[PDB]
């Protein structure tokens, strides 16, 4: 399974963009953690998700 | 405790607005189910969430 925000989800094979769209996420308003990496929502990589991947989608707030 | 998409979270006091913004979702891109009652993202109630509330947030897809 792929871990999304702390929950196991059958996401293997899907790209982050595909996943974010299925979440109804505003790309410009979030950052995405893929394992030991971070991306702005608009600049996530196209590498298909793999088993064991850990993904965290975080909303960018104003301090 | 408030159930959000099946998961328990301490969102009491927060409005749905606020929760959606903390989720970083597109208001226009989702539908929200407050206790089995459905709202378009932009037209969610403004009352603060309370213990026992069941919330479901679903992205609106294009079928076709």
From Swiss-Prot, chain A:
Keywords: Nucleotide-binding, Phosphoprotein, Thiamine biosynthesis, Thioester bond
CDD domains for this protein: Ubl_ThiS
Pfam families documented for this protein: ThiS
Gene3D superfamilies, sorted: 3.10.20.30
Origin species: Thermus thermophilus (strain ATCC BAA-163 / DSM 7039 / HB27)
Record lineage: Bacteria, Thermotogati, Deinococcota, Deinococci, Thermales
Transcription regulation in keyword set: no
Recorded superkingdom: Bacteria
Post-translational modification: C-terminal thiocarboxylation occurs in 2 steps, it is first acyl-adenylated (-COAMP) by TtuC, then thiocarboxylated (-COSH) by the cysteine desulfurases IscS or SufS.
Disulfide-linked positions: none
Function: Is the sulfur donor in the synthesis of the thiazole phosphate moiety of thiamine phosphate.
Gene behind this protein: thiS
Pathway: Cofactor biosynthesis; thiamine diphosphate biosynthesis
Protein name: Sulfur carrier protein ThiS
GO term, biological process aspect, one: thiamine biosynthetic process
Family: Belongs to the sulfur carrier protein ThiS family.
GO molecular function: nucleotide binding
């Amino acid at each position: 399974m792929v871990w999304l925000n702390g929950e196991p989800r059958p996401l293997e094979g899907k790209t982050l963009k595909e996943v974010l769209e299925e979440m109804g996420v505003e790309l410009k308003g979030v950052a995405v953690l893929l394992n030991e990496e971070a991306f702005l929502g608009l600049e996530v990589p196209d590498r298909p998700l793999r088993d064991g991947d850990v993904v965290e989608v975080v909303a960018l707030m104003q301090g």
